[PDB]
């Protein structure tokens, strides 16, 4: 657009810089300083995915501001949208596999303590990242972001396939959080119930209201509504603001609350 979309661009550049410094601190602390468990492997991979996504959002911010003020008319390449899509899908799939591993920890505690393979988690991590590549480049080369051209009749099909993948990740996160909540609300003795309940509803509403809108508008709404050309300048900058709020408040919730809280 013109000046109508300008203040979401400044908002995504403030929350993008906050997300870069948060995910940089989480990446440095879990890479080079602290001792890691399987959960720190999941938090580290989630911070890497959000670091890639917020890097590509802040360079989209910078090329839009270079288009507006300096009038350079720089063109970012088309594969940055592809690797940003891969970062977004991996950053949501880490949230789903965090909720699945917590459900397996509470429902099956003897197995999760004593018989869990220590090289499971990273293996699960790399397979989810592998599937992110299988949903990114097979997206992008059909949508013209790779190989300069592509059939849109296939591109819409692969957008619907990854939309089914996003609603599958949401029902896996919601079903696992529901199973963990009924397992604690039936059978808890010494657990901190209200803090655990509030953090579970916080992570579910972050995955619903913040992480999911950009994927639903980018892969699903844009093909099924068929008149979204005037709906763009309202729904798309607020969706990248909400997804950058998801990627920026994933270091603060999953690390600096779980593990940097007392200080």
């Amino acid at each position: 657009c013109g000046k109508e979309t300008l203040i979401p661009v400044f908002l995504i550049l403030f929350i993008a810089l906050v997300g870069l410094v948060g995910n940089g601190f989480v990446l440095w602390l879990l890479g080079f300083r602290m001792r890691r468990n399987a959960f720190s492997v999941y938090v580290l991979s989630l911070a890497g995915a959000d670091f890639l996504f917020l890097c590509f959002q802040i360079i989209n911010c910078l090329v839009y501001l270079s288009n507006f003020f300096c009038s350079i008319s720089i063109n970012f390449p088309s594969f940055f949208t592809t690797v940003m899509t891969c970062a977004y899908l991996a950053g949501l799939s880490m949230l789903s596999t965090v909720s699945t591993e917590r459900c397996l920890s509470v429902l099956w505690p003897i197995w999760y303590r004593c018989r869990r393979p220590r090289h499971l988690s990273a293996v699960v991590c790399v397979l989810l990242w592998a599937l992110s590549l299988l949903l990114s480049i097979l997206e992008g080369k059909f949508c013209g972001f790779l190989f300069s051209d592509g059939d849109s009749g296939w591109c819409q099909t692969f957008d619907f396939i990854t939309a089914a993948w996003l609603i599958f990740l949401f029902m896996v996160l919601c079903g696992s959080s529901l199973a963990l909540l009924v397992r604690i609300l039936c059978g808890s003795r010494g657990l901190p119930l209200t803090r655990l309940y509030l953090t579970i509803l916080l992570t579910v509403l972050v995955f619903l209201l913040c992480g999911l809108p950009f994927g639903i508008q980018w892969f699903l709404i844009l093909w099924i509504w068929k008149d979204s050309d005037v709906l763009f300048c309202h729904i798309h900058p607020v969706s990248v603001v909400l997804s950058s709020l998801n990627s920026s408040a994933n270091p603060i919730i999953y690390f600096f609350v779980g593990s940097f809280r007392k200080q």
Partner: peptide
């Protein structure tokens, strides 16, 4: 080629 940017 698709476009919403």
């Amino acid at each position: 080629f698709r476009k919403k940017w």
